[PDB]
Amino acid sequence: TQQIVPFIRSLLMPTTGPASIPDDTLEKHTLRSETSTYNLTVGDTGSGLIVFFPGFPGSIVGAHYTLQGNGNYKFDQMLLTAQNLPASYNYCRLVSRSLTVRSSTLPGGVYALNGTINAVTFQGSLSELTDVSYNGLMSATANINDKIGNVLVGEGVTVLSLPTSYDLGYVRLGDPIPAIGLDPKMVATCDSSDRPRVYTITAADDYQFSSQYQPGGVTITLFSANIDAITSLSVGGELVFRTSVHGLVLGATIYLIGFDGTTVITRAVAANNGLTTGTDNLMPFNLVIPTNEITQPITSIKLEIVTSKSGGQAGDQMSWSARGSLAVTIHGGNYPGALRPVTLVAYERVATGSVVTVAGVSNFELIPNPELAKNLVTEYGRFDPGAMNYTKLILSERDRLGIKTVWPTREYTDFREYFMEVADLNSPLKIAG
Amino acid sequence: TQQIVPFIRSLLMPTTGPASIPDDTLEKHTLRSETSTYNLTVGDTGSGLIVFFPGFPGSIVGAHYTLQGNGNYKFDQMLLTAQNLPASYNYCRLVSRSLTVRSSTLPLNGTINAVTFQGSLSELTDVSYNGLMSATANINDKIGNVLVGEGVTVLSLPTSYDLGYVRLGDPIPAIGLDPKMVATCDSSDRPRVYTITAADDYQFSSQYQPGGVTITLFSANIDAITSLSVGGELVFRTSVHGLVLGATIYLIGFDGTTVITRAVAANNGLTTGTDNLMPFNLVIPTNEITQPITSIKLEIVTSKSGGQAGDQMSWSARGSLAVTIHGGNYPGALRPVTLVAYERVATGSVVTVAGVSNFELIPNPELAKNLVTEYGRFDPGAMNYTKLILSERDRLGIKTVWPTREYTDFREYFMEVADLNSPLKIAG
Amino acid sequence: TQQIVPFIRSLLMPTTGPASIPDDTLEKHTLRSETSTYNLTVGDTGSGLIVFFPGFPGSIVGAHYTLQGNGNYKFDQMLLTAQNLPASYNYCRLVSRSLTVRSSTLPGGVYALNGTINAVTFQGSLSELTDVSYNGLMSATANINDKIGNVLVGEGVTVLSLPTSYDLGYVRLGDPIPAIGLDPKMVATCDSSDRPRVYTITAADDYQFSSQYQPGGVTITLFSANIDAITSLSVGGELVFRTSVHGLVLGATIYLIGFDGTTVITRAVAANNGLTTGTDNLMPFNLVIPTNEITQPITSIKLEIVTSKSGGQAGDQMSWSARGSLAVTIHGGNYPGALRPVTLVAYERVATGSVVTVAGVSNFELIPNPELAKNLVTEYGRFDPGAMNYTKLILSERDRLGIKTVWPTREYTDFREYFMEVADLNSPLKIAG
Amino acid sequence: TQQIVPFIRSLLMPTTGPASIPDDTLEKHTLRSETSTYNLTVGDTGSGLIVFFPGFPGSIVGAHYTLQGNGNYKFDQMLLTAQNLPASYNYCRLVSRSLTVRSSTLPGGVYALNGTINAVTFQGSLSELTDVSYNGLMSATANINDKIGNVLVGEGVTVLSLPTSYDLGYVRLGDPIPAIGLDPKMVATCDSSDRPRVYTITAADDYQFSSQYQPGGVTITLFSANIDAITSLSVGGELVFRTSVHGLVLGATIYLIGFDGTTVITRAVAANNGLTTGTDNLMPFNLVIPTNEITQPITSIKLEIVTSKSGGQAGDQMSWSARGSLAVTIHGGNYPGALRPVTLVAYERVATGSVVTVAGVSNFELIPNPELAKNLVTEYGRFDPGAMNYTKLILSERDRLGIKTVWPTREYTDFREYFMEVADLNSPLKIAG
Ligand SMILES: [Ca+2]
Ligand SMILES: [Ca+2]
């Protein structure tokens, strides 16, 4: 520390403002901060979960779920940046981010404040967590500085975004692209694409299906698989069906399921589709799911198949054989931060009707869209040598320095003042010559 | 050199263990070594080829092929890491790797030629024992006629730092009605894409045949070790009524053998005076690829419902296909290849492979519960020192393929400091 | 910092008292502090907005609006200086100002959980804000140190007035001028005038009006435009009307609308006014609106026109053509601070029946009115060189120093003690000679 | 203190993470932290007791008992580590541990006035405490730094684990061992065994029993004795019975009693043991009690004998003479930490229904089980000389330094910042060469 190092300051104290990442990704850019402010209402159980995407290169900050009587989560809302970055910028890179979660309210009739928080940073995407209960969170990492337990809600928790790789590319935001079309509801964007994530699902390898006839048909769930998506994705591939039985008609639908078990997206992949005897019957997958259709994080994908017969009787026995694999590409999905690190903040025993307050600052390197570029000057980052080495040193000593991704806010506040002991005006420039 | 530099030590002497790559890719990770041990049997000709993927970010180390009487190679087996990394880890980055190839038994014993080729397997123009020697112009990337008893050392030298973590082909939680159901999350970042314009108004013409007339529309060299997909469309036009088309894609192994065969369209009537579409929607999962893919070909069968003596079946075809091999362009995934060829080894003798691979790894969710991860040790000047060393690679004689005896000498010539640790023991 | 610099002390800690601005505006003046103290009552929705004019050269500090069940704002009261400066002084210049906004008290110096505060400093006048909702505030500036999000109400927010230009002229306050008149309600003042703001509205350029006869007439709103006024303004200009229809009578009224959509001032510009065929019919605008008539900040101006006929029957048709532009001059309106920077403090989730407490100090350079001048000594400011350079340095490093216009009070308090680490008695003057 | 000493840091501030114990026990191991998080509910009396085992080499942290109307304790639940260590590791050694006990229920929203805490560290096992009442606790030690009285529950208490011997062996955790068996409920473990604790109980030295016949038999309790167990144990030994009465049939049953006086385990030791007249009749004890059947700490052991007769009818006398010693071996029992030091945290006057929140961190040296060993690198501890001497010095001056095992949390927090005044980044490594 001398004066200090703008980047370290920004990284460890994001509410302080942005600084350019001192890596090798030399683009003309501009630096911006976006706040996140939410007042979430606590449900009947007094318990809930905030899912944060600490490294998300863009306006999506997280999602809030309330916990319900029956032990299921129910989606409340997305937590976003104050304004929608893709409306103004085309490219983006996350510099630093911190968020605070605390209660700001005790309801009218309530005698006493009570409530606690458990939090973890998990090195995987949302659907990869084996246990998302308040208690279960605590073992999602072995890293002591990536978990915090039973922090009082009144005091609150601070989430600090720590890097998962530098020298990351600029990410295209989901920015609208100039387009005209006959449909009012037409939407054209240029999506986060670099570093796609690909899931491959072999749904069947000569899977035999056999069942008696039914008016309305017989529906099966061929497979269900955990995947992650926040933004646009596509499904490709093909199933091949064989049969000895004449006049079978196949229906097939893909469902993308949210974290709360709810259907987010439903797409008929093939409806009413006759099968010929002694031949391959192809069922291609050509699905594109746009960002705006994804109303909450996708947590799994499943495929249902309906089998029905034209004629039909009592005992008819409908049978088919199926073979093939599908590929689910989520665009830009493997970009570190896009899906990968997840910070969960769980609360419980909070009085029903009380407010859980979220306040955050996100810092970005940004490239303006064409219209803004006319009035927004861009520059290469400030050069200071040793900024990156200092960052590397700090992170290398992360555990001995106690630099957490999840803090009791009181401890983070102490850390701020313990660190940051120099911010020294600027000695004789004022008296130099 | 002072003490030394863990990374340089790991890079130049991988059997020594792992060290974090001193680049800008700052992820919380863990460091691991995986051994490779194989005892390969020499075939009838006393000759064969080991294909190594020195930079492969994961458990695939290489493949062994024996050479046969008729001059063809025949696949033996994949050479892997001791345990399957994707079963325990989700993300991975290669730190360093070395492998030794020597004979260990007799039923002294023939010779080895080796090269590191800066391209993928199918790109090599000549893979014969002798032909290898000209795959590079780089003198430190080839070694000739090393005695098999003494053996060869393959050392993996970098092809780019600041590489992303690669997703391993890790199983993803999934339930399904089929026992043989498999769901993975694949190496995807940095795909390789081949584009094949199979036809641009290609005219086909032939007399009728019971059973049909089969043609190979195209054949093209491509590379795949892991999952890939084929997309695109052919469009067929015709003046002849009642023509039925069959089409199959074959993915062919290095040994000319069919690895994967997929019917793309079987029994498919063509209408007169219209475009007849033949879409390609193929996804090939990793587990189906039993040996490296070296080429792709498309066959088309043309038959007629009626049929007679002279019937003349004709169609016009147009369209291009795209073969995407997932994560294929990730440096190391397909790209550098080291070939170790042996010949004149006595039939029935053992060619012994022993290696160490070093990785930066991120544990899967279940292991993450008990596996602490950290940012890499900071030492400044580690990367500059690496850059200096590599910059002087040729004057230092840092080879990718060594006579083992020469590599051993190099180890002791380098690495002349490993100095205990002077007065920490007496400090205060 | 040596001892310190009175002006910097005053600027950054206004509760400390006044100091002369170290610019080139050398007037004999006197230095004063005026407190602002308000106990505002929270309405039904538990939500509201305080509009501050941090740079206002005089006694107007801000205005309080409650948010109502229906989602609309309603004016409560002006927030003023403790005493009315124009009653005692004729000229004035703002030195520094800070205000506190909080709620809730408990035995032990402790405060309760009582909702949240969002605040921004916007570099424009009140009516220029595109979004004034609690959440929308957060994007009124891109400047991270000019916005603060979801501060607990119990802890509260500190508004600090940062300069918008030095070397400003002394502003004439709205001081009463000696006058006698037959009317008890006669008022004569000398107004803030230097640096007027002028709006020009071309209300019509051959605008055709056409409508069927109506007993009582047909009223239209020719235009509506957002403008800003806190003090006196005037409307000048002329509309010209043409018509081929005989017997048309025009009425026209100007309305000045408050931030809460309420009519603040209504002035008939022309009532009962016959139009002649084939000639220009002039409608001049000669409006002067005195300060005392402006009961709350003006946010827009609109002009209504009534077209009546008197002798009209069944379905007659009334038509006229209109041409002309108006000029709205708000006196001293462009004086930096008079309208320009606005700080919004929005609260919500505040317990109904609790009181939002405002406490502030405003510091001024003042010239006494003739009666006070007889007993009020005035002087040129204390000379200290480097005071202005030091101010310029501090402001130049504003963002790295984290000098905010809106603070969580707790953070401002910390800043005060972090800064201001020298106030050193006065070493051997006491022992000198 | 220079930089500092990882071990001392871990010992005095366990929430900081683990460090290797600088003793002579040189094993290849790995270092881990496990959190403990509990939200306990306060019962009817507003009073209860948390029993901590601060030195326990494994996943058992303590047990919670509520106090009841009738003055008895009632077991609530075991307090454990976040995950079950024996599922992943085979050997273990405790490095350091701290736990926090406070009410998360804050009346008014801010106040810590919600009852009080008394706490002690007792140098013996649970059953050895003579007085376990809230008030009685205070005299369990004479050591002033091992007791704390009437700490406010809102502020809370910190339990710090201080060593009871170094150079301890690695303890085998209760890890499952590969086994197949016909019974679904079959369980095979390898238990903490090193350093057994043995109680010898001479239950009878020619004890004369005499009572009249009753259908179904006559039951006496031969003895009860205070013993301690949290994990597996076994009972060995023999009773010899003499009689003159023909056709007596003896049954024996061992009861293991919880701290709350509840039977945890009941095992029949003898049934249909027909006594032969005028001869030694042996009653061997061959009991093995597995860890898993112990649902709460065992505070005592008793043996009942049931004495029945064939054709007994009326004034038929039943009489036996008994002689013999039993030995109760609790496995690993004498391993310092396994049973020995106990920290009791008692609360009272807490409002019924409020939450007492426990949060802790436990640090371990661990050896992975065979499956984990495949992916878990193990190493000998970091060498730093003088670490152990420094620990010895610190502990030697424990009382003058005021290093407590039980703290008012506020005082512990102060201590943390008073200690730990160096954590100094790392000066010119960053600029060296
Ligand atoms: Ca770089
Ligand atoms: Ca000037």
Curated annotation (Swiss-Prot), chains A, C, D:
Compartment(s): Virion; Host cytoplasm
Amino acids binding a divalent metal cation: 23
Assembly description: Homotrimer. A central divalent metal stabilizes the VP2 trimer. Interacts with host ITGA4/ITGB1.
Name this polypeptide is given: Capsid protein VP2
Organism annotation: Avian infectious bursal disease virus
Range covered out of full length: 8 to 440 of 1012
